[PDB]
Design a binder for this molecule. Structure first.
Ligand code: NA
Ligand code: NA
Ligand code: NA
Ligand code: NA
Lengths: 107, 108
């Protein structure tokens, strides 16, 4: 080879082709946002919140809050379930891990 | 009065004791696709150099060095120099787990 550690590079490139690295940047980008991360975190502490709790927790308009929640929802960071009113919860125990490990690391 | 004030207030109080800001900085570091690739590739080998990394990404050495600088300022990678070989490894097991849990959650 006229190259550089080609065997290793080939094999790690083959590993990368096995996983959805595009999809992980999407999910981490959803969570990383300042207000989104505040949301995810609140949902770690209480099971369900409505959008107005979230507007008021963050100190943002409801339109701001719905936007953030939609973003979260599409990536599976959050669940919902609609009397007239949407209740929101963590999209899975995975998401509690992500935040709580993240938390623990920066310590 | 206003809306759900004491519950809002409670929760604002949790949030204030926690470094949400720093978490958001870490995930932002990891979340860019090329950096997310460098991150994942360091979950596979204990150590890699800037050259393995450019070659795995198919990028210039300069362009790998800049994403690695960005990863390293956030704690996401460490290195040990070798004499002009800079050898990166993950910044901690926590970084393996965020990536791996996010990948497996995306599988569902
Ligand atoms: Na408010
Ligand atoms: Na946005
Ligand atoms: Na960069
Ligand atoms: Na660690």
């Amino acid at each position: 080879i006229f190259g550089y550690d080609e065997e290793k590079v080939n094999r790690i490139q083959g590993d990368l082709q096995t996983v959805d690295i595009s999809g992980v940047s999407q999910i981490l980008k959803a969570i990383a946002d300042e207000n989104r991360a505040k949301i995810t975190y609140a949902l770690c502490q209480d099971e369900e919140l409505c959008v107005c709790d979230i507007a008021n927790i963050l100190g943002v308009t409801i339109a701001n809050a719905s936007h953030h929640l939609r973003t979260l929802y599409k990536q599976g960071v959050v669940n919902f379930r609609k009397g007239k009113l949407a209740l929101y919860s963590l999209g899975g125990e995975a998401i509690r891990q992500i935040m709580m490990i993240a938390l623990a690391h920066k310590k």
